[PDB]
Design an enzyme around this catalytic site. Structure first.
Site, PDB file in Angstrom:
ATOM      1  N   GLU B  59       0.825  -1.287   0.187  1.00  0.00           N
ATOM      2  CA  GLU B  59       0.046   0.199  -0.071  1.00  0.00           C
ATOM      3  C   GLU B  59       0.953   1.268   0.153  1.00  0.00           C
ATOM      4  N   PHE B 121     -11.128  -6.670  14.744  1.00  0.00           N
ATOM      5  CA  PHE B 121     -10.348  -7.369  13.662  1.00  0.00           C
ATOM      6  C   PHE B 121      -9.809  -6.542  12.581  1.00  0.00           C
ATOM      7  N   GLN B 122      -8.884  -6.131  12.320  1.00  0.00           N
ATOM      8  CA  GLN B 122      -8.125  -5.286  11.606  1.00  0.00           C
ATOM      9  C   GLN B 122      -8.704  -3.884  11.809  1.00  0.00           C
ATOM     10  N   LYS B 171     -17.382  -0.736   6.447  1.00  0.00           N
ATOM     11  CA  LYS B 171     -17.895  -1.692   5.835  1.00  0.00           C
ATOM     12  C   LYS B 171     -19.415  -1.796   5.513  1.00  0.00           C
ATOM     13  N   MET B 493      24.791   9.452   1.051  1.00  0.00           N
ATOM     14  CA  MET B 493      24.426  10.821   1.780  1.00  0.00           C
ATOM     15  C   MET B 493      24.778  10.687   3.263  1.00  0.00           C
TER      16      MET B 493
HETATM   17  C1  LIG Z   1      18.751  15.266   0.607  1.00  0.00           C
HETATM   18  C2  LIG Z   1      17.764  16.660   0.397  1.00  0.00           C
HETATM   19  C3  LIG Z   1      18.455  17.632   0.109  1.00  0.00           C
HETATM   20  C4  LIG Z   1      17.758  19.057  -0.223  1.00  0.00           C
HETATM   21  N1  LIG Z   1      18.545  19.941  -0.311  1.00  0.00           N
HETATM   22  C5  LIG Z   1      17.870  21.166  -1.063  1.00  0.00           C
HETATM   23  C6  LIG Z   1      18.351  22.256  -1.819  1.00  0.00           C
HETATM   24  O1  LIG Z   1      19.575  22.256  -1.784  1.00  0.00           O
HETATM   25  N2  LIG Z   1      17.803  23.418  -2.466  1.00  0.00           N
HETATM   26  C7  LIG Z   1      16.387  23.198  -2.559  1.00  0.00           C
HETATM   27  O2  LIG Z   1      15.658  23.930  -2.943  1.00  0.00           O
HETATM   28  N3  LIG Z   1      15.669  22.047  -1.871  1.00  0.00           N
HETATM   29  C8  LIG Z   1      16.332  20.946  -1.276  1.00  0.00           C
HETATM   30  N4  LIG Z   1      15.839  19.991  -0.643  1.00  0.00           N
HETATM   31  C9  LIG Z   1      14.463  19.998  -0.685  1.00  0.00           C
HETATM   32  C10 LIG Z   1      13.687  20.917   0.392  1.00  0.00           C
HETATM   33  O3  LIG Z   1      13.814  20.136   1.771  1.00  0.00           O
HETATM   34  C11 LIG Z   1      12.124  21.317   0.121  1.00  0.00           C
HETATM   35  O4  LIG Z   1      11.276  20.055  -0.208  1.00  0.00           O
HETATM   36  C12 LIG Z   1      12.236  22.201  -1.336  1.00  0.00           C
HETATM   37  O5  LIG Z   1      13.203  23.150  -0.901  1.00  0.00           O
HETATM   38  C13 LIG Z   1      10.732  22.897  -1.142  1.00  0.00           C
HETATM   39  O6  LIG Z   1      10.680  23.537  -2.330  1.00  0.00           O
HETATM   40  P1  LIG Z   1       9.331  24.609  -2.659  1.00  0.00           P
HETATM   41  O7  LIG Z   1       9.188  25.528  -1.423  1.00  0.00           O
HETATM   42  O8  LIG Z   1       9.299  25.233  -3.861  1.00  0.00           O
HETATM   43  O9  LIG Z   1       8.145  23.575  -2.772  1.00  0.00           O
HETATM   44  P2  LIG Z   1       7.020  23.420  -1.469  1.00  0.00           P
HETATM   45  O10 LIG Z   1       7.802  22.818  -0.168  1.00  0.00           O
HETATM   46  O11 LIG Z   1       6.040  22.621  -1.854  1.00  0.00           O
HETATM   47  O12 LIG Z   1       6.375  24.973  -0.829  1.00  0.00           O
HETATM   48  C14 LIG Z   1       5.580  25.588  -1.983  1.00  0.00           C
HETATM   49  C15 LIG Z   1       5.125  26.751  -1.156  1.00  0.00           C
HETATM   50  O13 LIG Z   1       4.388  27.440  -2.314  1.00  0.00           O
HETATM   51  C16 LIG Z   1       3.049  27.585  -1.710  1.00  0.00           C
HETATM   52  N5  LIG Z   1       2.091  27.453  -3.083  1.00  0.00           N
HETATM   53  C17 LIG Z   1       1.375  26.404  -3.383  1.00  0.00           C
HETATM   54  N6  LIG Z   1       0.877  26.536  -4.387  1.00  0.00           N
HETATM   55  C18 LIG Z   1       0.548  27.784  -4.517  1.00  0.00           C
HETATM   56  C19 LIG Z   1      -0.028  28.881  -5.622  1.00  0.00           C
HETATM   57  N7  LIG Z   1      -1.106  28.226  -6.465  1.00  0.00           N
HETATM   58  N8  LIG Z   1       0.061  30.102  -5.340  1.00  0.00           N
HETATM   59  C20 LIG Z   1       0.971  30.389  -4.342  1.00  0.00           C
HETATM   60  N9  LIG Z   1       1.679  29.670  -3.481  1.00  0.00           N
HETATM   61  C21 LIG Z   1       1.483  28.548  -3.630  1.00  0.00           C
HETATM   62  C22 LIG Z   1       2.856  26.412  -0.680  1.00  0.00           C
HETATM   63  O14 LIG Z   1       1.935  26.951   0.309  1.00  0.00           O
HETATM   64  C23 LIG Z   1       4.049  26.402  -0.161  1.00  0.00           C
HETATM   65  O15 LIG Z   1       4.305  27.668   0.721  1.00  0.00           O
HETATM   66  C24 LIG Z   1      16.387  18.912  -0.316  1.00  0.00           C
HETATM   67  C25 LIG Z   1      15.623  17.648  -0.085  1.00  0.00           C
HETATM   68  C26 LIG Z   1      16.496  16.362   0.256  1.00  0.00           C
HETATM   69  C27 LIG Z   1      15.731  15.110   0.475  1.00  0.00           C
HETATM   70  C1  LIG Z   2      -7.404 -13.944   8.782  1.00  0.00           C
HETATM   71  C2  LIG Z   2      -7.248 -14.121  10.156  1.00  0.00           C
HETATM   72  C3  LIG Z   2      -8.235 -15.207  10.892  1.00  0.00           C
HETATM   73  C4  LIG Z   2      -8.330 -15.115  12.160  1.00  0.00           C
HETATM   74  N1  LIG Z   2      -9.289 -16.217  12.905  1.00  0.00           N
HETATM   75  C5  LIG Z   2      -8.941 -16.423  14.217  1.00  0.00           C
HETATM   76  C6  LIG Z   2      -9.665 -17.624  14.741  1.00  0.00           C
HETATM   77  O1  LIG Z   2     -10.274 -18.490  13.968  1.00  0.00           O
HETATM   78  N2  LIG Z   2      -9.350 -18.118  16.063  1.00  0.00           N
HETATM   79  C7  LIG Z   2      -8.383 -17.228  16.938  1.00  0.00           C
HETATM   80  O2  LIG Z   2      -8.298 -17.796  18.215  1.00  0.00           O
HETATM   81  N3  LIG Z   2      -7.911 -16.477  16.466  1.00  0.00           N
HETATM   82  C8  LIG Z   2      -8.210 -15.769  15.122  1.00  0.00           C
HETATM   83  N4  LIG Z   2      -7.640 -14.584  14.535  1.00  0.00           N
HETATM   84  C9  LIG Z   2      -6.832 -13.938  15.338  1.00  0.00           C
HETATM   85  C10 LIG Z   2      -7.639 -12.891  16.307  1.00  0.00           C
HETATM   86  O3  LIG Z   2      -8.035 -11.856  15.412  1.00  0.00           O
HETATM   87  C11 LIG Z   2      -6.657 -12.416  17.621  1.00  0.00           C
HETATM   88  O4  LIG Z   2      -5.638 -11.968  17.176  1.00  0.00           O
HETATM   89  C12 LIG Z   2      -6.535 -13.584  18.606  1.00  0.00           C
HETATM   90  O5  LIG Z   2      -7.688 -14.460  18.478  1.00  0.00           O
HETATM   91  C13 LIG Z   2      -6.283 -13.020  19.852  1.00  0.00           C
HETATM   92  O6  LIG Z   2      -5.677 -14.088  20.688  1.00  0.00           O
HETATM   93  P1  LIG Z   2      -5.455 -13.852  22.143  1.00  0.00           P
HETATM   94  O7  LIG Z   2      -6.591 -13.193  22.969  1.00  0.00           O
HETATM   95  O8  LIG Z   2      -5.059 -15.066  22.891  1.00  0.00           O
HETATM   96  O9  LIG Z   2      -4.164 -12.862  22.162  1.00  0.00           O
HETATM   97  P2  LIG Z   2      -4.400 -11.406  22.682  1.00  0.00           P
HETATM   98  O10 LIG Z   2      -4.980 -10.404  21.619  1.00  0.00           O
HETATM   99  O11 LIG Z   2      -2.982 -10.649  22.851  1.00  0.00           O
HETATM  100  O12 LIG Z   2      -5.089 -10.987  23.934  1.00  0.00           O
HETATM  101  C14 LIG Z   2      -4.297 -11.365  25.275  1.00  0.00           C
HETATM  102  C15 LIG Z   2      -5.339 -10.833  26.444  1.00  0.00           C
HETATM  103  O13 LIG Z   2      -4.462 -11.454  27.674  1.00  0.00           O
HETATM  104  C16 LIG Z   2      -4.224 -10.401  28.174  1.00  0.00           C
HETATM  105  N5  LIG Z   2      -2.879 -10.454  29.074  1.00  0.00           N
HETATM  106  C17 LIG Z   2      -1.870 -10.557  28.555  1.00  0.00           C
HETATM  107  N6  LIG Z   2      -0.594 -10.708  29.263  1.00  0.00           N
HETATM  108  C18 LIG Z   2      -1.599 -11.245  30.532  1.00  0.00           C
HETATM  109  C19 LIG Z   2      -1.085 -11.847  31.906  1.00  0.00           C
HETATM  110  N7  LIG Z   2       0.538 -11.885  32.156  1.00  0.00           N
HETATM  111  N8  LIG Z   2      -2.059 -12.186  32.830  1.00  0.00           N
HETATM  112  C20 LIG Z   2      -3.265 -12.015  32.203  1.00  0.00           C
HETATM  113  N9  LIG Z   2      -3.625 -11.553  31.111  1.00  0.00           N
HETATM  114  C21 LIG Z   2      -2.800 -10.956  30.345  1.00  0.00           C
HETATM  115  C22 LIG Z   2      -4.189  -9.262  27.504  1.00  0.00           C
HETATM  116  O14 LIG Z   2      -4.403  -7.894  28.122  1.00  0.00           O
HETATM  117  C23 LIG Z   2      -5.226  -9.426  26.351  1.00  0.00           C
HETATM  118  O15 LIG Z   2      -6.652  -9.153  27.139  1.00  0.00           O
HETATM  119  C24 LIG Z   2      -7.420 -14.455  13.178  1.00  0.00           C
HETATM  120  C25 LIG Z   2      -6.507 -13.714  12.489  1.00  0.00           C
HETATM  121  C26 LIG Z   2      -6.442 -13.448  11.372  1.00  0.00           C
HETATM  122  C27 LIG Z   2      -5.458 -12.724  10.413  1.00  0.00           C
END
Ligand SMILES: Cc1cc2nc3c(=O)[nH]c(=O)nc-3n(C[C@H](O)[C@H](O)[C@H](O)COP(=O)(O)OP(=O)(O)OC[C@H]3O[C@@H](n4cnc5c(N)ncnc54)[C@H](O)[C@@H]3O)c2cc1C
Ligand SMILES: Cc1cc2nc3c(=O)[nH]c(=O)nc-3n(C[C@H](O)[C@H](O)[C@H](O)COP(=O)(O)OP(=O)(O)OC[C@H]3O[C@@H](n4cnc5c(N)ncnc54)[C@H](O)[C@@H]3O)c2cc1C
Ligand SMILES: Cc1cc2nc3c(=O)[nH]c(=O)nc-3n(C[C@H](O)[C@H](O)[C@H](O)COP(=O)(O)OP(=O)(O)OC[C@H]3O[C@@H](n4cnc5c(N)ncnc54)[C@H](O)[C@@H]3O)c2cc1C
Ligand SMILES: Cc1ncc(Cn2c(C)c(CCOP(=O)(O)OP(=O)(O)O)sc2=O)c(N)n1
Ligand SMILES: Cc1ncc(Cn2c(C)c(CCOP(=O)(O)OP(=O)(O)O)sc2=O)c(N)n1
Ligand SMILES: COC(=O)c1ccccc1S(=O)(=O)NC(=O)Nc1nc(C)cc(C)n1
Ligand SMILES: COC(=O)c1ccccc1S(=O)(=O)NC(=O)Nc1nc(C)cc(C)n1
Ligand SMILES: [K+]
Ligand SMILES: [K+]
Ligand SMILES: [Mg+2]
Ligand SMILES: [Mg+2]
Lengths: 598, 598, 218
Positions: B59, B121-122, B171, B493
């Site tokens: 992602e 979950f998630q 969802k 760098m």
């Molecule tokens: C390793 C490294 C080294 C770097 N060294 C340099 C360096 O030497 N020189 C350098 O330039 N950069 C350097 N940078 C990048 C730097 O950190 C900034 O990202 C960069 O300088 C920002 O450029 P900017 O202000 O033009 O763009 P931005 O950060 O995007 O700022 C744009 C500004 O214009 C405004 N603005 C946006 N749209 C409009 C609009 N339609 N009308 C009016 N205002 C607007 C925004 O609000 C903002 O205030 C480096 C980056 C890294 C990772």
């Molecule tokens: C695709 C998928 C499918 C899943 N399906 C299942 C399934 O079918 N069955 C299943 O079991 N799981 C399933 N899970 C996992 C599930 O989501 C949980 O992660 C899992 O069930 C949690 O198990 P747990 O409660 O034992 O552990 P935990 O989530 O870590 O909970 C532990 C609990 O015990 C407590 N605790 C911790 N330490 C102590 C201690 N020293 N003394 C007392 N209490 C303590 C904690 O505070 C907590 O309340 C699935 C996960 C995925 C990704």
């Protein structure tokens, strides 16, 4: 006063003080990646022989490695990254660690204090961003308070329910030198209540009335070395069947006749049936997650009835008050460490020799509800269930501990189902957040924690694609992990839901895979590819016999559902079971609807 | 009333309403990855012929792709991901987009409303987490307000300073069906103030007094199609030299004699000298970032003096009030779109034929401050500066637009320096946050936006390692991107800073690389490796002539500093310049200190 | 208590759950928790530079605020500086009482409703010594038009704004300081004053100031 103050750190930079505090906290491994803001710390740990440094390819890798390390070892996983993108890249691992109760201590570099709040170069508000996915976080504002903050971080991360913490380290703080004495208590790392004692006695009385007890054990039991031992002692004494969560796998020896295997959405129908019919549920370190309970209003009907009639109910051993009475009402809540409370609980529990009727039902349920599936047929691809069984059987024959990590999806569930779990901290999987890509870096972290263990990453092809760059990290770290990619050329878990709920409309759930053998070769990793049934046994043996990092690709059957399954909204005992004829009809329907494409 | 209400969406699911609103917002491309919570939306867009869907491997890839798309096209980049880890994985791209002013609209699936706040979950608190790295975010709570929220998201993302927004989609909301009419204004997408008009007149009078004016142009000028045109018109009319930021590269034709090239930490010493001596600075869409200003208290001494004496100063054309007077005090602040305000500004500006003394100095400075470096010697590796020049020269000879993306590090700076920039929106680089791994996915996004453009990712080996899995994404998307990896086998760098400030103590800044040719082959991508000087020309030609995705690896000289350099804390005209003898002495010192290792 | 009374003083809140305050301590705690509680090279150089700037000034003015009241020796050292370098003193609303208004050097309060003499003086001063004051918008008037002579002097390297401030957040927040002296203003004044040249008379400057005070009573 001189006795209470310490001047031994005077003259050191914040970076050097960081190094010393790592030593005092018995940190032997740091996972991290350098950058401008964190340079003073990296200079301080330059060529340190006091701990192993592990370099990933991506900071998310560092995070998941540290998680894998933490879960294998029981120690906090320490992460060291730079400001901005270095820090934001650890957000998913932090959220992951929070959901799964993993002690993670993240140290992130930060722009100088003079530049904070100016939208500075590589400045992220990581304290703000990480607030919702950490137990606690802080920004160190001067070097004198750095030892204190490090102590607080480690303490919070490892107490209560373990979880992630973040400590933000401004560049000018870590570069600055301590010029003053600090309280000596900050330079050093670190009885049951009357109320809880009464709860335990009441809980014992309730269990001593139970005719159909069941133990529902989770990750919490693994947070004490004596955990599994006392779980077994309770189960033996009162003669109680034991089911575990996904995260509790290994807490109880599944070869024991009392084992009901895993419960939940994809758990054993025997376990699910048992908990729905039990009159007393003993919840040991488990949080009643929605993957486990099924429809909450329909969960544990017999235990709720028993509670109302004063002859049973739910006994919840939980360390975090937030998770007590959060999902279901506990009949008795026993607050604190479950293992410590079990020591007080068990001697109050009556010893029981036999439960003829209850165990008759349980044995009947176990007999009628195995993890059944469609076996291989002549010419067919390898079934993913069969592959897991093969790996489980062969891995058990080595005189080494076997640790399993997984990705997220069908392979993960099949791994849970078809491995035989016997040892604590051998299932290392992303359960709460469910992060794809977890498998490979977690395996590296676990392997570093346990250099003599066989570490197997049971991975999906889509999951493995997320973080496959970390293969080079395994080689550089000297971690001989074993990655098995179940290649069904699909996002199987999502296609299962699309088959079931969306009439076989597979919307963007087929990512193209690289050549995994050429990939492994490019990463300087051994490569094995199993393409047919006749290569399964010898291929898996070569996989396990390898003494180097190895990637095993296995071509497995596509469009195969994980069963049993409790669909969303259904009661825990309202399950879908595997049926040979239904599967064939499903295949026909899928083939027709997709015009023979799937 | 019937005229003001709309019932045309009644009967549609939230997912289907999402699809329709994408159409009405002229979205032609969506970058995303499926998952459980976002399934109702993915079902709705199943086999849609209304836009192109691009599937990454991660992602973060989707996020950076959408950024690359947005910056190449000037349209918002749309991201569609699932809940939990799907959403947290887009945090770095969101923070990236915020820092660089990129219009990003992120749609994230969420657990059902009935499950929110239960640690489901998630479930991630993505609204909480993304709050600090979005202009605005929201969680849709019912389907009736979904069209409104989508409108608000696109509007906020693309107005003022463009930036990322997130819309959280439960969802059950996206699965639910609209049963009621909604205000018809929500089903549809969307004069200068007296105060600003006076500011413009005052600004014109100030410029008409200036004897040493300079234009300091940034990304803001690129946010209007007429931007570069009016910039040129102003520069021509009043005879003004033009320097740009990193993000402003391409806004002004660098072949023009008035071009002073890039300013800042690694910018031209001619540009840096000019701005430090100018009596009037015209800031056009630039935010005075700390990479540009050098020591702030020592920045623009002559312009500050001129302001105090009422004969010059700083004229800031800025759209966001937050960035006006944030870093330096503006003599006149002109609020609003810089291009629109330039239309009012220029006719008030006196036409000027010659500035003999000022341009004499500027030409002298340009002569004495080229981007000098140590050239190849017999048997030496290819110099990274020379490589960039080769690519720039050969790329210009095709009858196609050329768009450049980069990773983060030395290669990025050398790309900025040694390309000749002539066209708007051809430099697509992570500047504010500075995210390694940006290069490859950004290139894919830019290539999708501009199918007929040559898109070149100038990448570092460490940066490329971060996200190299997205090579398969380029192939699957049919995006014939051109990746050039400058392989110096180091985090260059950071090692430059370790050489300079930490006495050649290279702390964990050398990651091991995969075999990039075998990697490319595994990804079904063309591979080219250039290892010596004699292969440079023909290798680059094969690289550019390719009509398929191609990965070029070039072995370049290690431990070479980017110069010129304004070290932190130094005035903008207090620069380090390249010197042949100093470089040799540096090599000797490094060799001795590392025992000949580096 | 520590946070409330250090840096810029301010409010803190401690939330006390009923069951916590009712509960009894059953365990030992670190003895450091049962008990209440040198100038940097960078600041020292800033002070020396600030002294050199003031020693060039022909029209200095002290702009004193609440910060000078946060040390018992505050008013004493303020007076010592004003006497030694012969400098007129104006205060904020919150700084009232820090300087004896019966002193001829007193310019009274400045700002929106302050003395027009004080307001005129600060707009014409070539060196402004800000002592524990935060350039609030009730005091500065139009910010872009504030202290024109001090800004000119700064650009010409013969004056500017010398800001003695304990909180980094309030340094360069409103106006650019020519020299920022971070820390407790009173403590820094002890280092500052001995570097400041003693001055007997400022005939022209105090002629203007006396003229302004005469024409601008309340
Ligand atoms: C390793 C490294 C080294 C770097 N060294 C340099 C360096 O030497 N020189 C350098 O330039 N950069 C350097 N940078 C990048 C730097 O950190 C900034 O990202 C960069 O300088 C920002 O450029 P900017 O202000 O033009 O763009 P931005 O950060 O995007 O700022 C744009 C500004 O214009 C405004 N603005 C946006 N749209 C409009 C609009 N339609 N009308 C009016 N205002 C607007 C925004 O609000 C903002 O205030 C480096 C980056 C890294 C990772
Ligand atoms: C695709 C998928 C499918 C899943 N399906 C299942 C399934 O079918 N069955 C299943 O079991 N799981 C399933 N899970 C996992 C599930 O989501 C949980 O992660 C899992 O069930 C949690 O198990 P747990 O409660 O034992 O552990 P935990 O989530 O870590 O909970 C532990 C609990 O015990 C407590 N605790 C911790 N330490 C102590 C201690 N020293 N003394 C007392 N209490 C303590 C904690 O505070 C907590 O309340 C699935 C996960 C995925 C990704
Ligand atoms: C109706 C009305 C009209 C007003 N008009 C005026 C007016 O005309 N004139 C006027 O002056 N005020 C006026 N005010 C008040 C004005 O709003 C401010 O409250 C006041 O000017 C602030 O004064 P101060 O900066 O001295 O104190 P503060 O606001 O408290 O600022 C003190 C500064 O010194 C710093 N500091 C604190 N302790 C130390 C230390 N130990 N060492 C160094 N630095 C330290 C602080 O961090 C802070 O930056 C008015 C108020 C009202 C209600
Ligand atoms: C980072 C991320 N994105 C999306 C998801 C949603 N998701 C997705 C897309 C799954 C498919 C897993 O594919 P796989 O190949 O890795 O495994 P299987 O084919 O065996 O299911 S599983 C799942 O929960 C996720 N869990 N994590
Ligand atoms: C995700 C992330 N982590 C760390 C950094 C810090 N960082 C690092 C580690 C750089 C080295 C870049 O290595 P490279 O090989 O990609 O490029 P060069 O060797 O040409 O510098 S550059 C830089 O700013 C970063 N910018 N982004
Ligand atoms: C991370 O930035 C800051 O922390 C930072 C941010 C804003 C102001 C000042 C700094 S800094 O002066 O204290 N450190 C750096 O500038 N480091 C840095 N910069 C580059 C361009 C490359 C490398 C390797 N390091
Ligand atoms: C994402 O989870 C939730 O959104 C979610 C979260 C908590 C409760 C209910 C739900 S849900 O019922 O509304 N959706 C799913 O359970 N989806 C899902 N689950 C799995 C195990 C695999 C796949 C492909 N999808
Ligand atoms: K099993
Ligand atoms: K150039
Ligand atoms: Mg798969
Ligand atoms: Mg490199």
């Amino acid at each position: 006063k001189e006795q209470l103050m310490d001047d031994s750190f005077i003259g050191l930079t914040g970076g050097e003080i960081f190094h010393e505090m790592m030593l005092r906290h018995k940190v032997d491994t740091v996972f991290g990646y350098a950058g401008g803001a964190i340079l003073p710390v990296f200079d301080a740990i330059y060529n340190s022989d006091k701990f192993k440094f592990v370099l990933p390819r991506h900071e998310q890798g560092a995070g998941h490695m540290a998680e894998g390390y933490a879960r294998a070892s029981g120690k906090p996983g320490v992460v060291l990254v730079t400001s901005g993108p270095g820090a934001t890249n650890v957000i998913t691992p932090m959220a992951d660690a929070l959901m799964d109760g993993v002690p993670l201590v993240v140290f992130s570099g930060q722009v100088p204090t003079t530049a904070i709040g100016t939208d500075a170069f590589q400045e992220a508000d990581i304290v703000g961003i990480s607030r919702s996915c950490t137990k606690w976080n802080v920004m160190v504002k001067n070097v004198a308070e750095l030892p204190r903050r490090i102590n607080e971080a480690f303490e919070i991360a490892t107490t209560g329910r373990p979880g992630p913490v973040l400590v933000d380290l401004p560049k000018d703080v870590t570069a600055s030198i301590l010029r003053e004495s600090i309280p000596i208590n900050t330079t050093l790392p670190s009885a049951v209540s009357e109320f809880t004692s009464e709860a335990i006695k009441r809980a014992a009385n309730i269990l001593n009335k139970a005719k159909k007890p069941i133990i529902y054990a989770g990750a919490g039991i693994l947070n004490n070395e004596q955990g599994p031992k006392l779980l077994k002692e309770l189960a033996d004494k009162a003669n109680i069947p034991v089911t575990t969560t996904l995260q509790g796998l290994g807490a109880f020896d599944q070869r024991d006749p009392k084992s009901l295997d895993m419960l939940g959405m994809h758990g054993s129908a025997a376990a699910n049936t048992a908990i729905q019919n039990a009159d007393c549920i003993i919840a040991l370190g488990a949080r009643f997650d929605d993957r486990v309970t099924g429809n909450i209003s329909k969960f544990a009907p017999e235990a709720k009835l028993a509670a109302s009639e004063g002859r049973g109910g739910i006994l919840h051993f939980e360390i975090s008050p937030k998770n007590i009475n959060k999902v279901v009402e506990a009949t008795e809540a026993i607050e604190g460490d479950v293992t410590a409370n079990l020591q007080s609980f068990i001697p109050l529990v009556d010893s029981i020799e036999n439960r003829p009727e209850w165990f008759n039902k349980i044995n009947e349920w176990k007999k009628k509800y195995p993890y059944s599936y469609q076996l291989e047929t002549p010419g067919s691809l390898i079934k993913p269930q069969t592959l897991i069984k093969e790996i489980s059987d062969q891995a058990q024959t080595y005189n080494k501990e076997v640790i399993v990590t997984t990705g997220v999806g069908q392979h993960q569930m099949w791994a849970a189902q078809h491995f035989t779990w016997t040892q604590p901290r051998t299932m290392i999987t992303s359960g709460g957040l469910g992060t794809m890509g977890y498998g490979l870096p977690a395996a590296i972290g676990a392997q570093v924690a346990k250099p003599d263990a066989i570490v197997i990453d049971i991975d999906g092809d889509a999951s493995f694609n997320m973080t496959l760059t970390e293969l080079s990290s395994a080689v550089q770290a000297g971690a001989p992990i074993k990655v098995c990619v179940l290649n069904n050329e699909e996002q199987g878990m999502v296609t299962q839901w699309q088959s079931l709920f969306y009439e076989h409309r597979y919307s963007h759930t087929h990512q193209s895979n690289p050549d995994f053998m050429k990939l492994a070769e490019s990463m300087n990793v051994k490569g094995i590819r199993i393409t047919n049934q006749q290569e399964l046994k010898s291929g898996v043996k070569e996989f396990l016999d390898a003494t180097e990092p190895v990637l095993l690709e296995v071509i497995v059957e596509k469009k195969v559902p994980v069963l049993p399954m409790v669909p969303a909204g259904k009661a825990l005992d309202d399950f879908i079971l595997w049926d040979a004829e239904v599967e064939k009809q499903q295949n026909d329907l899928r083939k027709e609807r997709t015009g023979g494409k799937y």
